Design a protein around this ligand. Structure first.
Ligand SMILES: Nc1ncnc2c1ncn2[C@@H]1O[C@@H]2COP(=O)(O)O[C@H]2[C@H]1O
Ligand SMILES: Nc1ncnc2c1ncn2[C@@H]1O[C@@H]2COP(=O)(O)O[C@H]2[C@H]1O
Lengths: 201, 200
């Protein structure tokens, strides 16, 4: 059982958010911490022209908006959009800091999540620096194929994903994803038809 | 410095490291936490080929090797090499977790640094994804103009970085860096005198 989590949750005010709604806006003054009770969200950044890139998918049990907790006057570092319908707990940093005194184990949990996120984001940095847009998309297709939800196909592995989700992962437009996917098909690397993509061998 | 910091340091061993020496090797079993008492280090990762990429620079007052602390059986996520001569304090994770029980404020200081690192690293992800090699270099020069080792100037400030270094942060060749540094000079954005660049 987890008494610490119930204790924490009891000090928050829980709300429901339909999918696609924005929970956090980049630039806002940060004064509250969030905790995903149910559902999943996408943490994303945009460029001066609206092109989006997902930094991470966050799910049940994950804290959100923790980056502004340690210093005053911080701004939210990214937008957070509900991927599915969510049930999110919210609490002011001020109240949260009071809880940390009563039981530091709650901070230990938050920090464990921050360390994992740093490891994963550093990994992305490596890829963005070493691969160009074509390689980024190819490697993404390979990783998707290696995932558990990836189905087995007569000629390799089959994955389901829209050209737009791929664009969000690599940080390019869906039209760009379209051109590269077309090129990859001509090189006999994949087979794209509808929302289904077959990765060969 | 303050009493809490000094309290933490009294439970550590302080070791000296010369320039270019490796403090942490990627893949090692993470069992120790470090604190930079004096000096500077670089955090590096690389691709299947051996090409190095500078993830970050850390300085006096920064903790290092904190990532493997929250879960046992983890490997160091990167290589950490001394940029200058360093004076680094170290303590076992086991002993550190004990200190947390006495005074959690020590964990707060650590977590604050991790939060900052996540912000900076995420920003780096944005730069690499949305900026062309030229855009990256212009930004990097500014990020470097913010370093503690940067010198002032009657026209902006100055850095003593090399073309290999810049290429390692941005993700490009020494040649390309030169090519781009040249352009930025024509456009009156910077001025290079040897290994010294004056960022306006
Ligand atoms: N690299 C990342 N990985 C995971 N989550 C992140 C990352 N960058 C930002 N976020 C989350 O997005 C939130 C935006 O608001 P905050 O900056 O307060 O806190 C941020 C973290 O919760
Ligand atoms: N993105 C990053 N920014 C700053 N320091 C980092 C980053 N990634 C790794 N490190 C540091 O490099 C260390 C490598 O060993 P650890 O993984 O134990 O701890 C890591 C952190 O101390």
């Amino acid at each position: 059982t987890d008494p610490t989590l119930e204790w924490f949750l009891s000090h928050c005010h829980i709300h429901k958010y339909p999918s696609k709604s924005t929970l956090i806006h980049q630039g806002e003054k940060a004064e509250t911490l969030y905790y995903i009770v149910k559902g999943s969200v996408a943490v994303l950044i945009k460029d001066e022209e609206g092109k989006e890139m997902i930094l991470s998918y966050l799910n049940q049990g994950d804290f959100i908006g923790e980056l502004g907790l340690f210093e005053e006057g911080q701004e939210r570092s990214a937008w957070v959009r509900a991927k599915t319908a969510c049930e999110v707990a919210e609490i002011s940093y001020k109240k949260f800091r009071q809880l940390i005194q009563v039981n530091p184990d709650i901070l230990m949990r938050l920090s464990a999540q921050m360390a994992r996120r740093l490891q994963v984001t550093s990994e992305k940095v490596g890829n963005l620096a070493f691969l160009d847009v074509t390689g980024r998309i190819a490697q993404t297709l390979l990783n998707l194929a290696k995932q558990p939800d990836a189905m087995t196909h007569p000629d390799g592995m089959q994955i389901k994903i829209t050209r737009q989700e791929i664009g969000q992962i690599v940080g390019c437009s869906r039209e760009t994803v379209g051109r590269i996917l077309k090129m990859l098909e001509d090189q006999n690397l994949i087979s794209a038809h509808g929302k289904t993509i077959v990765v060969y061998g």
